[PDB]
RNA sequence: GCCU
């Protein structure tokens, strides 16, 4: 998957642990980006609604998606 | 695994 942007900050809109995905609102563009549980760095791979996260934006098979999702430090 |  092609990297489109790196070191992007965003706010978690919601993340559903039953379905394994959610959306992050990018702080730089105000657009939502899909996030799958497997894209979150070390339950073990989850983020919380309302938290600020840092991530890359990549081109998945269905459009842009988050990758390498971590805390901002 | 694209609005729960």
CATH of the domain at A29: 2.40.50.140
CA dihedral (A42, A45, A50, A54) positive or negative: positive
The method recorded for this entry reads: X-ray
> Cβ distance A53 to A15 under 8 Å?
no
Domain span holding position A45: 1-73
CB A55 under 7 Å to nucleic chain B: no
Cα A54 to Cα A68: distance, rounded to the nearest angstrom: 8
CB A56 under 7 Å to nucleic chain B: no
Cα A30 to Cα A43: distance, rounded to the nearest angstrom: 27
In sequence order, what are the beta bridge partners of A59?
A64
Q: Is A34 exposed, middle or buried (0-12, 13-18, 19+ CB in 10 A)?
A: middle
> Cβ distance A12 to A71 under 8 Å?
no
Is the backbone of residue A3 left (phi > 0), alpha (psi -120 to 50) or beta?
Answer: beta
Tokens read off for A45: 């791979």
Q: How does DSSP classify residue A20?
A: T
- Resolution of this model in Å is 1.4
User: How many domains does chain A contain in total?
Assistant: 1
């Amino acid at each position: 998957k092609k990297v489109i942007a790196t070191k992007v900050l965003g706010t978690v809109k919601w993340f559903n642990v039953r379905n394994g995905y959610g959306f992050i609102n990018r702080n730089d563009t105000k657009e939502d980006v899909f996030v799958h549980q497997t894209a979150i760095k070390k339950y073990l791979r989850s983020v919380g609604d309302g938290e600020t996260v840092e991530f890359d934006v990549v081109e998945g098979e269905k459009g842009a998606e988050a990758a390498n999702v971590t805390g901002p430090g």
